[model samples]
Target chain A: ASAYQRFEPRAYLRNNYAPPRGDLCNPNGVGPWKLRCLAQTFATGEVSGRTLIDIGSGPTVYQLLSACSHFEDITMTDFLEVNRQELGRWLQEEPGAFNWSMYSQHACLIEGKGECWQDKERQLRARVKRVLPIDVHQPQPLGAGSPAPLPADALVSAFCLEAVSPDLASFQRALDHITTLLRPGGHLLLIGALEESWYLAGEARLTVVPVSEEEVREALVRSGYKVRDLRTYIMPAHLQTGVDDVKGVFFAWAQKV
Target chain B: PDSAPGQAAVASAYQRFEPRAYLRNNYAPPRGDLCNPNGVGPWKLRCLAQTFATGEVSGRTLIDIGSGPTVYQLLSACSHFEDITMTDFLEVNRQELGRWLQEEPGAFNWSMYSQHACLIEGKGECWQDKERQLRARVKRVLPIDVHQPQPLGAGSPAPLPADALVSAFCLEAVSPDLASFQRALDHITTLLRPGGHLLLIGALEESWYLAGEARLTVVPVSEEEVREALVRSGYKVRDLRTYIMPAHLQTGVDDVKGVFFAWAQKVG
Candidate 1:
């Protein structure tokens, strides 16, 4: 009974992603900025752990590309079944899977690792073990009978919290719900579009809870995270591309206390 | 009519809350292992068994509010009361208790819990006798809503004031916020006689939990908050115990930090 119930995965991918948000060639583009932010954070060697969980991975593996190098066990979770299926296609190398060649290669280039893109993809595929359902709105997002390990050492979420929440209060609550998945003192790598109220995904015009930089900082602190670093990226007029009125993007790196 | 949509959401969500599924979730498996040293089922059973053993909470009449679909919370107290009444907001739950009371098919077996209750009591009593004792004592199973001012409908039953009241995981779990939780606690006080005992158990620091198709929100209360709520409702706490959840038992069902038991006397 919500906008997310009508989300179309394929249409969403074609809309914001290939429409230029997913382009890897532009070094200053929002996509590369997010990728580079992770590489830089990983370069500091603070977020490394034996296990990592991608909080709301919607048919996208780009967020975990850099994280796979540091974690032996990685988990990808999503609320929509279709998104999980889409991820399985690429992970299982189905006949017509979404090509992620450029993403891995770009990640490799930024990390300055000598490994080939094929090996990078293979490495990511090997480490990425599970794709389970998640509901950040629930107190127990993965349900009480989940098979995934609880209190993961580290968590990474991209454009999920604000994009999926109905309002600021729910957004803050969703933040708390996801925080329960992480162990105390564990690092959280977060990314999201700021001041975006709505977006189109084929038949579903998803409602988004517009949030600002200060609000995100306040929510994280209130949710028991010690802020380590925070940054934002304003969208250039030309790259905006009429997909959605996303004023800018924010990235945060923090540790749960 | 209702204050906010949250109340409506809470009511709508619970319609899908199946009774049998709830029994299976909390009444079975690692959680249900009565013999296990660290099991929640054993811990809750032990807490209640020890509290009632003091013989201070016993009376002629006992009322259990929001009985849900389980009889484990009432097992120890059943022997101490002559006229026992249980209430639940859901009819299916009432029927669940009826099935057990009437010895109907598909009724959940609580002999394991019953057996352990006697084991803790150290009585020469058998489990079958304990089950029968409880079954004979429960006089009625009726509808109840803890949020209402009159937990039992406004003016129908003249059971007047129950000598004691018992509630487990009912207030905090059903209440959407801390204020509502306080209100529900005070509301249930209407059912108890002045100077009667109130035996209460609740989840600690739990915001929400899952039951079948329903995902319910809880008002996470701390031990300090619980004690204050009791005092505010004019109850003098005689004994309060806290049980923390070990790492192995940290299931994804809900983020419960621990459980608490408070044996309070309703001050006159």
Candidate 2:
């Protein structure tokens, strides 16, 4: 099947055209659920002065922003140039809001943004510390000109993992591409559509191929994440909205061993 | 050692919702933010990581008050600690958690991680066995009724003062009034050793978040309100953080507020 036909990106209209780059899986700063959770985890001294990589980051950059506060260094990566640019704008615009609750006192977040392979060397020239990117399938060399299998301590993704790739194989391949970047005992925080579609900016006609939590866990295990916990968060069914009431989205967290 | 009160009745109710079939079965399904009394909602295992971190479970003694039909928290802790005593106002919860432990010892061997762990029933009067098993390391589960003061264990000096006390997704709606809730805090504080930590996680905008097919009412509390409650509850703020899971994502309510997580230390 053609890529567009195989993965439906345009099943339901997006309620919000503009989604902010979130930190710690929370899109809005209004509530601190995700951040607080991450904060408490980090506060336990489980992840002190480690390296972090945020994958599949969107316009609302939660993974990298909040992680920048916890880890000593961070790297942000994305498949689309626009998405990386949005993350950069968020960092430069409101750097403080993106900090982690406990560890921000001594952490610095550097952008390895931009996915254009042509300028790969220049993009990674700074010895950039942190990388947060939104790519369903891990990007080549992790950025414009960096090396593949970028070693790091943790990987965080929200809303972007389910969007990449055409099939389960593609999703699994993406998991491999990224897990290769972590050292043993690394952490993963995954958030996105659980039973979701393969919609991208260029597609229409709902292109969803739902995968259960077990299937996702299988992929994570195959890739190397320990798959410590699998929790699903669902929105209440709307009595109204004639629409399908938006089912199959979840906020998940995992770890790499 | 065990609390002998109402064991038979709790056992009868527990027969309907067996832990092996219910929680163990739903272990991988939707988690109720806190293993919820029922297991159908978002995955809440992420939140419990800190509870383990705050107080090491290895060989630690615990007294769980108001333990529900599901003792996921206590069970999980047992993996690290050795001596565990589960308590609940509802006899069914006691029977359910206790029976699961006795019947399926190996099934839930996270107890292996604990130096010593056991399941018991009731509070105060029922805490005799726990006192014998856990020795002096007693932990207590208090009454949601601000007026009630229950011991952590029988003759376990200073009640069930613990290294860490966890009240997951509780507190906001249980009390008749916020003032009484503060008084209850003062009462429960006696159960903690000086500088012992207290972990509080509850629905911030969580009035009636979700109860399977029905929506249950949960009182929402603000960050400031939580801080105030902590101050009045005989705890000195050691560390505090809040997370907002907007109602839209979980409840589909546009104006739905966020949740709060507070980690405080007992000062006085």
Candidate 3:
């Protein structure tokens, strides 16, 4: 059986997803790095689009928390039912939902827009159009029964393909599958782990298809996409843990052909 | 990151070439500088020799998987195993080994490497004897393709399984991607007897290497990935060591920043 067949979304949340700690406001931590890159991309005025889709969005909105105001329509998706439910709870502002106020506040500071955390949070909430389900391995990721959704002007995918696919071929196919939802010349923002073969999600050990910078670029070109810009974040030695062996993180801004 | 046009430029720059000139320029060197004291050569020889000297390494038959015209790694394992089979993907490398084993003219010299192994084994001035033993013990030089489920592929006489296997810098250099690297490692396990030994050496975070004028792609790997690949492939790592190359040796001939040596046992 494939290693990721045992994926448990709740366990993944308990282990990897949490509100950034008090010390994460600096440039070194993951929160700031993610915010800085997303913010920097939007800052370039390159993210202006009609509809933006967040593909394989686990249970977090940190990726989109900064860009909520840049796009007209926003949709979030995940493969697991539990993750979709988790996103819904946060979207509906259900009691005891995962708190993302810290992320909003950090993003506000990075933006220097003088907007309060509540305002940033509200804007993201209001802009989110729907929480959908997607299976990247399928030809029609949103499924055939559902109404054909319009092609997205942009897509944000973070740490999805490597965690789900068992090999590089599957990864390339999944990439092509997801790109079908994107319009011609639209943008694709991707974030992923580098040289990480495995990660811990609660009690479950998930596999990651280790990728190099060159392979990532190669896959993008083969899929009819052009890279606009790329950013990398090397893991700090002190932050190494039993959870994952992620040597670094990467962010790529690519455009579909 | 290379832009779209830049990416295409990089792609068009690479052309798949044969391994003959690569072997001549990189492996058959007075400039075959990998085995020296300051380079990866002496350190790896000492590491393997010391491991074998512990009396913990012994088997009836051992196969050197992807033996790319290089025999320095197996010099220490000669006494412990009665039969050795060295395999390579390219016939050029296979022929190079055959020339050395037959004492042919202009065979690439491995005497300095053998002497290094000799000193590490604490045996005085027996470098020539060690070389001869290794040559005589190696019974076959066959071609292999690690991308296949049966890496040796049709009609090879190396046998179904052996007591142990040793490989160095072959898998990463040959594999085009990470998935293939893992699969190739899995295919290698089919050749080893249960509870047998596996001595592996490889580079870390190397994206590419230049062997003569041919630029070969390499899958960048980390210590963590190596450990995960081993456990997932049904082997228990007994020992793992890493060596960081000094700046002088990082001359862009290869992207290798560090070298790793691992000793593992196939699980029952």
Tens-place lDDT per residue, model 1, A35-152, is 8899999999888778889998998899988899899989999999989999999999997688887677667667764344667798899998899999998999889987778779
Chain A TM-scores of all predicted models: 0.97, 0.63, 0.93
Q: Candidate 2: which docking quality band?
A: incorrect
Q: Between candidates 1 and 3, name the one with more favorable lDDT.
A: 1
Q: Model 1: which residue pairs collide?
A: A144-B252, A144-B253
TM-score, chain A, candidate 1 = 0.97
Q: iRMS value of model 2?
A: 23.4
lDDT of 2 by residue, B1-268 (tens): 2223333433343334434443333232332232132222322333444445554323354445445544444433444445445454445445555544554544442321111111111011111232233322223322222234643434543235565565654455344345645655666667667766666666565444332332333345678878998987777776566655533244342123655656677775
Q: What CA root-mean-square deviation does each model show from the true structure?
A: 25.0, 20.2, 26.3
Those runs of model 3 whose alpha carbons end farther than 4 Å from true positions after fitting are A1-10, A19-23, B1-268
Fraction of the native A-B contacts that model 2 recovers = 0.00
TM-score of 3: 0.47
**For all the predictions, what are the DockQ values?**
0.01, 0.01, 0.00
Q: Which stretches of candidate 1 lie over 4 Å from their true place?
A: A1-257, B1-4
